[PDB]
Design a protein around this ligand. Structure first.
Ligand SMILES: Cc1ncc(COP(=O)(O)O)c(CNC[C@H]2O[C@H](O[C@H]3[C@H](O)[C@@H](O)[C@H](N)C[C@@H]3N)[C@H](N)[C@@H](O)[C@@H]2O)c1O
Ligand SMILES: Cc1ncc(COP(=O)(O)O)c(CNC[C@H]2O[C@H](O[C@H]3[C@H](O)[C@@H](O)[C@H](N)C[C@@H]3N)[C@H](N)[C@@H](O)[C@@H]2O)c1O
Lengths: 408, 408
């Protein structure tokens, strides 16, 4: 009753937030003492594991004033800014406390520098009202055009490039591939329109760098993979497009525990070693789960890879039964969205999660053996996770029909 | 050269950031080993003291997952929301990572609830471009009218009340008195326009509550005094005006170290004891300093009280000389803005600081003896610290003239 906001979090079947009282590594403990395996991981921001020792020791020293104070520039900030630039590229870098803040600030800065009114957008960019819209493919009141990753619509808007300030996309790699990114970049280069790569979720997710070399971003944003859940986002890119960032300052800019979490996490993420380990362990869990369901005739497949994957169910009913069965075994999934294991998802935890998937499979057998994975199932589950249209061959009339089905 | 932003921080006379390696209580240590007394305190967000051990212990435990994880609701959140509603009041509460984000979210929500386009504003509300304006007393492109705490301009805009969604003010108590607040509240009650009290700086600063009972805010925001520098801001007030906050969610919402810092700090700030101790200690420093300058012919006075005060210098040459002399003695002032001691500013620190101020006064004696504080000195100093016009008697044409001198 007290809380005016509606934060995204795991919720039970009746909509009330699931309470977890402690966590460590890959395991969460609920009030009754039951241990769950976390695949949500603070919506993908805990990439090293809950309570990671090295980060925790750095945070504790920073809370005791040993590595700088919030009053002033600290010795470690230069190394943070320098490594961000080495890993992600760009002329200049900037820092924020949320992805929402970073996305609003850089989009306004790029719009100002370009002196053009229209921004074309696909993917989620945060909660700020500037992104709200009543319908896709047309400007909202802030000049933003949602194009749902549809390149026919994008091509049309870019055929009048004079008025387009920038294209901002949150890249997805479960449902968009080489073909889509090659044509996206071809179109934007032809229009000479700068691209803002919103890599809040996928920046540093797959390797020590941005998510695909097929994109050529003028500006990038990363956050979830940067600080093991502490509130830090970073931006970088072309100096003239980010000129307006000179007016950005906020009180907690130099707060030392966030600085400790970001520097300690980035030094490790910049080696690529956590992403490689997560990839191997997650790949094993995916392969085990895919074969389990296929052998038991459960109509649920997987998209993505070990770093970032999602469940594709034939229908809503299937997804509901899956989610109840998963919860009963102590698997904590981000329901209808993407699963992002952390480095704490070791070989032993994989074994444990596979045993829990074995029991979910056994609890779903013979209930939905008839149902097929239709094109409708693939678009609906992709729409939940990457917030637009999957790259699957389709007619223009089919685009309209999908959007009519799925738009909120 | 890497940073695209210009964060507010102590800088030397050439504009380069002063670097500090470590801090404990009221003392900072610089790279050369010199100890400085901090009056800036992360722009007033460190109210207990750098490295406060009780907060550090709670942060360290939270960093190890001992009371919750960023994935999910936990009991620490229930207690925090309850503590906020108990100290500040209101129907509902919400949380943010910065004062800037909180102010933008509540202002948009209130404007949408009121279905009116004009917001009247005084004081600083954060870095977001929605507050940028070319001229005072006229609506910017977002419908916001800056009125610089001038109640004659406010009365003019409230004489046409039907299009005024809200009045948002950052209360000042160094240069605005009881008479200002009683007339402000009378005018806004008469127009039936809700008041948003931006108490990011002054909320809990002076007592265990908001800054003055002479305001009747429909919505309040606090931050600086909440978490000893960790990135937490809170809002609350009338449920119907904050209904759009149901759309607010962000990835780090459940981040446990920030919640640990806030619950621990707020528990101490809710007793009123830290603010009483700071008031007493800061008052002793102010009295000593005012007399040191006065008895040496140095044209520098002080405004405010022990919780929050500022220097008022005859002119900018005096202020520049004062700031250079202060840094030479290891006093770390928020230059040209307000000083906010922490609870680590104990009597032993007061005595040290008074000796340093004696040396500052000695360094300035004889340089500026023939200069005096004018009304222009008071308006210029107030403008830098509270971002509007001091409450001194003046006509409407004198207001225009002062603003023409000070508007940047
Ligand atoms: C790509 C991207 N850009 C910006 C942000 C905003 O960052 P902050 O949260 O730090 O401000 C994010 C945030 N990612 C959160 C999830 O967004 C989508 O899912 C839904 C959210 O769960 C919900 O809270 C929103 N109201 C709607 C949104 N569609 C993604 N499906 C999910 O994968 C993300 O974890 C970015 O991801
Ligand atoms: C009252 C108030 N509301 C909102 C904010 C924004 O909070 P966040 O910083 O967490 O986003 C603040 C912040 N206060 C910081 C200082 O602001 C003013 O000082 C100047 C700033 O330092 C500078 O960055 C700005 N460009 C201009 C601004 N005038 C206050 N004078 C200073 O006293 C504050 O400490 C609020 O204070």
């Amino acid at each position: 009753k007290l809380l005016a906001q509606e934060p995204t979090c795991p919720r039970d079947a009746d909509g009330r937030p699931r309470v977890f009282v402690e966590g460590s590594g890959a395991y969460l403990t609920d009030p009754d003492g039951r241990r769950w395996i976390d695949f949500d991981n603070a919506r993908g921001s805990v990439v090293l594991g809950h309570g990671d020792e090295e980060v925790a020791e750095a945070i504790a020293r920073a809370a005791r004033g040993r590595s700088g104070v919030g009053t002033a520039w600290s010795p470690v900030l230069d190394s943070l800014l320098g490594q961000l630039q080495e890993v992600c590229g760009g002329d200049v870098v900037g820092l924020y406390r949320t992805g929402t803040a970073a996305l609003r600030s850089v989009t306004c800065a790029v719009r100002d520098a370009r002196d053009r009114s229209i921004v074309l957008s696909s993917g989620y960019h945060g909660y700020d009202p500037m992104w709200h819209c009543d319908e896709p493919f047309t400007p909202n009141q802030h000049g933003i055009v949602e194009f749902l990753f549809d390149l026919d619509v994008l091509a049309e808007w870019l055929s009048r490039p004079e008025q387009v300030a920038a294209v901002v996309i949150s890249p997805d790699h479960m449902h968009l591939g080489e073909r889509w990114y090659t044509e996206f970049t071809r179109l934007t280069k032809e229009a000479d329109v700068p691209v803002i790569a919103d890599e809040v979720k996928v920046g540093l997710r797959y390797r020590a760098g941005l998510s695909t070399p097929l994109l050529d971003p003028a500006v990038w944003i990363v956050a979830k993979c940067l600080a093991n859940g502490s509130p830090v986002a970073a931006v970088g890119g072309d100096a003239h497009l980010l000129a307006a960032l000179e007016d950005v300052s906020f009180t907690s800019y130099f707060e030392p525990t966030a600085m400790a979490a970001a520097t300690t996490t980035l030094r490790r993420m910049a080696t690529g070693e956590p992403q490689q380990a997560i990839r191997a362990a997650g790949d094993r869990f995916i392969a085990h789960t895919r074969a389990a369901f296929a052998n038991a005739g459960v109509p649920i497949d997987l998209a993505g890879n070990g770093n970032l994957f999602q469940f594709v169910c034939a229908d809503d009913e299937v997804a509901d039964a899956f989610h109840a069965a998963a919860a009963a075994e102590g698997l904590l999934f981000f329901e209808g969205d993407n699963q992002t294991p952390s480095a704490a998802f070791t070989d032993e935890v994989v074994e444990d999660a596979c045993g829990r998937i074995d029991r979910v499979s056994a609890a779903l057998t013979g209930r939905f053996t008839d149902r097929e994975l239709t094109e409708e199932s693939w678009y609906a589950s992709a729409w939940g996770a990457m917030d637009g249209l999957a790259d699957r061959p389709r007619t223009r009339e089919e685009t309209t029909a999908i959007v009519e089905r799925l738009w909120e």
